Ligand binder design. Structure first.
Ligand code: T3P
Length: 124
């Protein structure tokens, strides 16, 4: 039902805050973006930049994805991100996440017309 571009937006964009300011950020966000509905998604990164700035990464440095594909792009500049990772104690339906805020380059895979992000590969 969901398009790949829409799924990327839902899972990875949070332009409403400039950074995670709370250890509970990931618990709240993972739930509100419906990433804990049927299982606990083990890892997920939110990006705190405008949608335009993230879409613009598809015209920046072309690099290999972890899987060997060559439609990945690394941002020229660092971006505000929050990594959310399940803790060792987490068990569905009570998903529990560690929140780690950082400023780093992002790497996304791009596809389509318009050519936009569809997968979050990594941050560096
Ligand atoms: C390593 C890493 C993976 N992931 C993601 C990308 C994926 O979802 P997606 O491909 O929908 O963007 C996923 C594995 O399926 O874990 C992050 O969101 N942040 C990370 O730092």
């Amino acid at each position: 039902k969901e398009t790949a571009a829409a799924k990327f937006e839902r899972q990875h964009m949070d332009s409403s805050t400039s950074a995670a300011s709370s250890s509970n950020y990931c618990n709240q966000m993972m739930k509100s973006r419906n990433l804990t509905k049927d299982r606990c998604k083990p890892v997920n990164t939110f990006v705190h930049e405008s949608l335009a700035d993230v879409q613009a990464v598809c015209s920046q440095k072309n690099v290999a994805c972890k899987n060997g594909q060559t439609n990945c792009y690394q941002s020229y500049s660092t971006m505000s991100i929050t990594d959310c990772r399940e803790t060792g104690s987490s068990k569905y339906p009570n998903c529990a996440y560690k929140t780690t805020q950082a400023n780093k380059h992002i790497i996304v895979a791009c596809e389509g017309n318009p050519y936009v992000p569809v997968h979050f590969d990594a941050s560096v």
